[PDB]
């Protein structure tokens, strides 16, 4: 498996500015500007509640509301990813 490489170098030859860009047109938008509310329970926060049985109630209720919510059995490689859906329709979802 051969490989070819070659070093190079450059430098801005101008005193002031020399080049300029600008946004000109608009192709398709990439993220649907919908209503995908966040969820804080993804975070291993600090001071927790006192009774573990009300934390579960809170999480259960708030996971009954949206579709972005962590999986229940905490995996071991990576962290608390959201449920992988079957199909995606309008594009990447924005996190309101």
């Amino acid at each position: 498996n051969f490989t070819l490489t070659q070093p190079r170098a450059h430098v801005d030859l101008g005193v002031g500015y020399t080049a300029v860009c600008a946004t000109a047109a608009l192709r398709c938008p990439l993220t649907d500007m919908g209503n995908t509310a966040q969820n804080l329970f993804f975070s291993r926060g600090g001071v927790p509640m006192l009774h573990d049985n009300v934390t579960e109630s809170l999480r259960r209720i708030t996971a009954s509301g949206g579709r972005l919510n962590p999986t229940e059995p905490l995996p071991i490689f990576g962290g608390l990813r959201p449920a992988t859906s079957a199909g995606i329709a309008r594009g990447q979802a924005s996190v309101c």
Binding site: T23, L30, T36, P82, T84, S85, I88, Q92, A93, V95
Partner: protein, 48 residues
């Protein structure tokens, strides 16, 4: 910024080719990976 006392008009050199703050191929908006070379433009976070 390191040059908070040196540069007078960094408005240009701070708002040209800022690197992405998130991912773009995930079914949600995730934090940026370590190895994404995407490069964007941000007029919003420039003036806050």
């Amino acid at each position: 910024v390191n040059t908070n006392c040196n540069t007078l008009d960094r408005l240009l050199m701070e708002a040209k080719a800022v690197a992405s703050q998130s991912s773009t191929d995930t079914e949600y908006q995730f934090k940026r990976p370590p190895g994404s070379t995407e490069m964007t433009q941000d007029p919003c976070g420039l003036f806050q």
